[PDB]
Design an enzyme around this catalytic site. Structure first.
Site, PDB file in Angstrom:
ATOM      1  N   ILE A 171      12.660  72.721  72.208  1.00 35.52           N
ATOM      2  CA  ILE A 171      12.282  73.483  71.041  1.00 35.52           C
ATOM      3  C   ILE A 171      12.644  74.923  71.387  1.00 35.52           C
ATOM      4  CG2 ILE A 171      10.105  74.311  69.878  1.00 35.52           C
ATOM      5  CD1 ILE A 171       9.381  71.313  69.577  1.00 35.52           C
ATOM      6  N   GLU A 184       8.915  64.485  72.565  1.00 35.16           N
ATOM      7  CA  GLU A 184       8.585  63.477  73.242  1.00 35.16           C
ATOM      8  C   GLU A 184       8.459  62.348  72.780  1.00 35.16           C
ATOM      9  OE1 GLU A 184       8.931  64.251  76.473  1.00 35.16           O
ATOM     10  OE2 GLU A 184       8.037  66.248  76.917  1.00 35.16           O
ATOM     11  N   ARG A 214      11.843  60.960  72.661  1.00 37.54           N
ATOM     12  CA  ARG A 214      12.323  60.578  73.776  1.00 37.54           C
ATOM     13  C   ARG A 214      12.012  59.334  74.129  1.00 37.54           C
ATOM     14  NH1 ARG A 214      11.243  66.413  75.878  1.00 37.54           N
ATOM     15  NH2 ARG A 214      12.950  67.313  75.718  1.00 37.54           N
TER      16      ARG A 214
END
EC number: 3.2.2.22
Length: 246
Positions: free
Chosen positions: A71, A160, A163
Site C-alpha cells: 500500500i 495479506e 497473498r
C-alpha cells in the site's frame, strides 16, 4: 480498479473482492501454479486503485503497487496521504494528482514502523470486517497515531488476505466480530518474501527449498516448510513476490 462495500458485506462478497484483487495483479508466469508477480511495471500502470466504502457509504481510494501488493497511499476527500518512503513518493507522481493537498505521513509503511506509531503490536489489534469499517472511518479524518492503527487493519484485511488463502478465511470468520490475528496469521505475513524466494529457487532443485522456512502452526508453534508439496505451497500462498525485488 477493484471496489468493496462494507454495507451488506458477508463472507462471500468479501471472498469476491479478494478474488478480484488477486485477479487485478499482473503476471506472466506461474511457478508451481502460483502467479509470479512482475519484476517491475513502468509508469502509472504500476498502481492499482482500490475503492473501499464503510457501512455508511463514505469512501477512501487506496493505491497498491502491483509488483508487491504494498500500500503506497490513499485519498480521502481532497487530501492524499502517502507513506514517508521513496516508493510512495514516486507513486505520488502518478496517482491522486487531482488532490488539493498531499500529506506525507510521519512513518514508512512497514509493520515495525506502523506498530511503533500506533503504540500496539498487531497481535493486540482486532481485525475483521467491523475493524475494516472502523479503519476506513478513521482514515477519513487525519490523525497520524490513529491512522497507523487503521492502516495495520487495512493492510491485513486486503493485501495479506490476497497473498494467503488462510488469511482470507480468517477474515471471513471475523465478518461480524473482530478478533486479534492468530500467531499463524502473523508468521505467514512475516514469511511472504522468504517463502516466495524459496518456491522460486525450488524450480531446478526438484521442488526442494534451498533453505527451509519456519512458520508457527495455528494450534501451537514451530514448523519447517522444506519443499513445494507442503500445504502452505499447494493450498495457501496465492501470489509470489518476484526474486528481483527480494
Amino acid at each position: 480498479d477493484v471496489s468493496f462495500r462494507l454495507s451488506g458485506a458477508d463472507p462471500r462478497s468479501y471472498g469476491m473482492f479478494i478474488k478480484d484483487l488477486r485477479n487485478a495483479l499482473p503476471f506472466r508466469e506461474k511457478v508451481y501454479n502460483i502467479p509470479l508477480l512482475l519484476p517491475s511495471v513502468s509508469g502509472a500502470g504500476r498502481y492499482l486503485l482500490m475503492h473501499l466504502f464503510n457501512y455508511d457509504g463514505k469512501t477512501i481510494t487506496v493505491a497498491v503497487d502491483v509488483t508487491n501488493v504494498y500500500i503506497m497511499g490513499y485519498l480521502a476527500d481532497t487530501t492524499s496521504y502517502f507513506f514517508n518512503e521513496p516508493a510512495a513518493e514516486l507513486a505520488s507522481q502518478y496517482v491522486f494528482r487531482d488532490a488539493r493537498r498531499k500529506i506525507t505521513l510521519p512513518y514508512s509503511g512497514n509493520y515495525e514502523r506502523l506498530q511503533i506509531a500506533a503504540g500496539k503490536p498487531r497481535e493486540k489489534i482486532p481485525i475483521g470486517l467491523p475493524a475494516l469499517d472502523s479503519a476506513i472511518s478513521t482514515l477519513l479524518h487525519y490523525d497520524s497515531t490513529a491512522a497507523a492503527g487503521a492502516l495495520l487493519v487495512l493492510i491485513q484485511t486486503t493485501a495479506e488476505a490476497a497473498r494467503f488463502k488462510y488469511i482470507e478465511q480468517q477474515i471471513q470468520e471475523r465478518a461480524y466480530r473482530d478478533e486479534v490475528p492468530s500467531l499463524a496469521t502473523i508468521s505467514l505475513e512475516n514469511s511472504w518474501s522468504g517463502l516466495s524466494k524459496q518456491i522460486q529457487l525450488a524450480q531446478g532443485n526438484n521442488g526442494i527449498f534451498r533453505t527451509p522456512i519456519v512458520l508457527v502452526d495455528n494450534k501451537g508453534n514451530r514448523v519447517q516448510i522444506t519443499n513445494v508439496t507442503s500445504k502452505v505451497v499447494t493450498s495457501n500462498i496465492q501470489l509470489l513476490l518476484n526474486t528481483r525485488n527480494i
